[PDB]
Amino acid sequence: MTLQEQIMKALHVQPVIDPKAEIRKRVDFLKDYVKKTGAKGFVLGISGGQDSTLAGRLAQLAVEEIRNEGGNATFIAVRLPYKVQKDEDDAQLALQFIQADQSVAFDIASTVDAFSNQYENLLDESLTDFNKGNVKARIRMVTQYAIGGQKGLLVIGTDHAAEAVTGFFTKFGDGGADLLPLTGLTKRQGRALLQELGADERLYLKMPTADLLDEKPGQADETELGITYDQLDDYLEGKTVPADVAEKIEKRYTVSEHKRQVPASMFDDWWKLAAALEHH
Amino acid sequence: MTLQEQIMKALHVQPVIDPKAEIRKRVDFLKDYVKKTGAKGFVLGISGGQDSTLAGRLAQLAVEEIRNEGGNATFIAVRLPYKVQKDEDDAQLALQFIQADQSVAFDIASTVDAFSNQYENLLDESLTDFNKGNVKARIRMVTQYAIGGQKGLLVIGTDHAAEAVTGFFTKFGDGGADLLPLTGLTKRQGRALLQELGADERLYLKMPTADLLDEKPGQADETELGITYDQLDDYLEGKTVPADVAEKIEKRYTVSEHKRQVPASMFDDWWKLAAALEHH
Ligand SMILES: Nc1ncnc2c1ncn2[C@@H]1O[C@H](COP(=O)(O)CP(=O)(O)OP(=O)(O)O)[C@@H](O)[C@H]1O
Ligand SMILES: Nc1ncnc2c1ncn2[C@@H]1O[C@H](COP(=O)(O)CP(=O)(O)OP(=O)(O)O)[C@@H](O)[C@H]1O
Ligand SMILES: [Mg+2]
């Protein structure tokens, strides 16, 4: 069991998949979980990006099936821009594809700014662009849970293997959710499901970006990672990649284990086994 | 095993403890974890309540020890009142016991209110007192992670067995943290450690409360739970409790499992095993 193989197993990666079958299993999962909780549906932030576009369509398909089976369910798609979003057009395109039961726009700027201003005033320092970025992600979580709390809906998370292996998400930000329909999927597999679902190609060819920085809006995930999704997917799907690349993927995986586990206690072994861990 | 024995095991409860030894193991844990992360210390919200008073003191002892060992570390105690806290006096007493390296005060009202006003504005509905309360807990998490990110500090969590068994915490609010030094302790045992640390009796005789509601400030945990900590501790320590009390505890434990697990995916078994889950 090489590290690459342990990672593939831990992240539930399927080297080869059947898009129609994956969609069936993932829509079934959303239905099975919600039935267990007695919730009234789901809520999800739609950014115009690939992951939320796919997760959103799966959620709409799920509630429509729940209603067809005689149940009661609704899906609310939520736009969460910080001021004017650079790629609002792509978000609208995603909304057109998702065809959600309900959609609403919630500018998170006033909340994020109220916080940053207060921080600056009381801590005698300004938030670095990166840290304010994480505030944005966390406020998006807050917004989705508030709507979920008010309407009795579960919060959908968009985590998948290509993001999980690098711990490329904000802890308790977009990482905070109730259920994950995309777990185990590589980035390219995600595009494959989108194609099967008949999505406009602009929805899966668009460049992946967390778009949280004020000074570098729309920054490419790969620019930040120093690794391309092509390499990540190759690695995750069990293919051979340059020792150079493998080492970089594996070190990022091992140091971010804390983001894939519940808070650490003295009774947990994962952190003791880890040679090291990095939070900042 | 009885469900009680299963719960005791799952939550790492020790029916009998030696306060002195517990403090040593828990302080050692904080030192061991931070050391493996290269972080510069810890950050924790100090409410004036039992849990943060104890976790706060353990963190201070941990950084003093790290420094005595030739390392570099600091502990920042942070006051997080929403506007003006009724028991600010108890919080001041707590700070005098903790004797943290540094302490700051951060009013979360402007951020929370900015959010609430935007919510009412955009969803044409006001947040219920309970949901606004969760917004407060979540903004407290945001604040600690902001300070942590800015100063390279790990966020301490105050979860313990008496809270874990009932899922009595806000998901991604006070539930969001990096490490938990109090894991496994019953409420009663926590007081024992505080007594061993020579805490002013007011710090552990004070009524437990999340104090998140505008309409019912300082509301007792027991009132909300319908279960006393005296009963929870007896149950957790392996003692006999009335059948009806045990039933209520066990039902709450089973339905709150999702709060003690990372977000659910179709590959997890815990939710499939659960006969029912409760999010609202
Ligand atoms: N501006 C925005 N509006 C709404 N939701 C947003 C958002 N920015 C982030 N989110 C939420 O946060 C999640 C994580 O963001 P990302 O990591 O960038 C994946 P994505 O944006 O959905 O596709 P991507 O990889 O193409 O960038 C999104 O899937 C979405 O649910
Ligand atoms: N007003 C406040 N100021 C600072 N931190 C606060 C706070 N209210 C809540 N917190 C943070 O949230 C955590 C969880 O709150 P509680 O569940 O009520 C435990 P406690 O307040 O510390 O002791 P308690 O059980 O006596 O209420 C606290 O331990 C603290 O870290
Ligand atoms: Mg994105």
Ligand SMILES: [Mg+2]
């Ligand atoms: Mg309290």
